Amino acid sequence: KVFGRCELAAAMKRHGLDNYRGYSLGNWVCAAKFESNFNTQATNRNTDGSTDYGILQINSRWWCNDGRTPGSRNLCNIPCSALLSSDITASVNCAKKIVSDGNGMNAWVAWRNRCKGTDVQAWIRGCRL
């Protein structure tokens, strides 16, 4: 499923991401935009044996189990396939865990490179929230 900007904002907000650990909703929308272009089915297969999964491109080495990645930690305790769902719940639950496990939003290269420092509030401007 390919989300609209405002639709994703709403869903993220209902899942409690607005101000989670001090990151305003717009940072989360911005991360998803540049990680996956809002595509819940996005996958990125890396040369390192790991794969990035879903709307926030969560990596298989540390966060989920795909059964094919070396050094697998499965810290979100889920199969990577749960991250390819049209419903964003599993992705949101794991993102919160990533931020809880001693990482900021810097765990997302796209956030660091394309959102950090910008006016992220643009991403939710005009939306019903």
Name the residue type at position 40. Answer: T
User: Closest by alpha carbon to 64, among 74, 53, 51, 54?
Assistant: 74
**Which three-class secondary structure state does DSSP give residue 101?**
coil
Domain of 61?
1-129
CATH code for the domain in which residue 6 is found: 1.10.530.10
Active site residues: 35, 52
Q: Among 109, 112, 98, 121, which residue's Cα sits nearest to residue 29?
A: 121
For the chain, what is the domain count?
Answer: 1
Per the annotation, does 101 bind a ligand?
A: yes
Resolution to one decimal, Å? 2.0
What are the angstrom distances between the C-alpha of 40 and each of 23, 52, 53, 56, 85?
A: 21, 12, 8, 8, 6
CA atoms within 13 A of residue 21's CA, in its CB half-sphere:
14
Q: By what technique were these coordinates determined?
A: X-ray
